[PDB]
Amino acid sequence: GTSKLKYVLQDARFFLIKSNNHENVSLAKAKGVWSTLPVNEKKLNLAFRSARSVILIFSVRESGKFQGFARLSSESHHGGSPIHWVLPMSAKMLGGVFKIDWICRRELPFTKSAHLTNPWNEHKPVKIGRDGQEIELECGTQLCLLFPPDESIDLYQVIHKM
Ligand SMILES: O=c1[nH]c(S)nc2sccc12
């Protein structure tokens, strides 16, 4: 069902996250981590303290799809295990590392979100946006609800972190 998912998304904030390569999304899916440039790191840390859930929605550039979505479980932190991101740019330019819990590891093609517009990006289609673009609550909730259910994930433990 979708009830626990709707509960996790209640009053959430949503951010579009863009990667030039699939390998970085695969690393994030395997390790439960994400890292971004300082400008976005500051926005996400502010958001994490402001809302019950902060949701990252991932898209690999030129793939025509979103690759899933995850909830921040921590602010960014430095000094952990190195992550061998594939960068376009040195690794020192990245901020710290956020821990994330995946909510959905399934893909969604952009063709399926063509009816969703993001007020925070001039009401352009939600697929359109820079890395770090915030997605308004209603649009972000509907986008997440369009993804295929991911039956491998149990949201019970996620709910307990809220
Ligand atoms: O594609 C990217 N660009 C930047 S600036 N940082 C990262 S961290 C993982 C992927 C990725």
Residue 41 belongs to domain with CATH number: 3.10.590.10
Q: How many angstroms is the resolution?
A: 1.3
Write out residues with Cβ below 6 Å of ligand 1: 19-20, 24, 35-37, 85, 88, 94
Domain count across the chain: 1
Alpha-carbon Rg for the chain in angstroms: 15
**CB burial of residue 80 (10 Å; 0-12, 13-18, 19+):** exposed
The Cα–Cα gap between 104 and 3 comes to 14
- Name the H helices within the chain: 3-9, 22-31, 38-50, 137-146, 156-161
Ramachandran angles phi, psi of 136, nearest 5°? -60, 150
Residue 86 CB: number of other CB atoms within 10 A?
12
Q: Which experiment gave this structure?
A: X-ray
Ramachandran angles phi, psi of 17, nearest 5°? -120, 125
- The closest residue, in CA terms, to atom 9 on ligand 1 is 24
Q: Which residues are annotated as a binding site for RNA?
A: 18-20, 34-35, 85, 131
- Find the domain containing 94 and state its range: 1-162
Chain gaps in the chain, named by the residue before each (C–N > 2.5 Å): 88
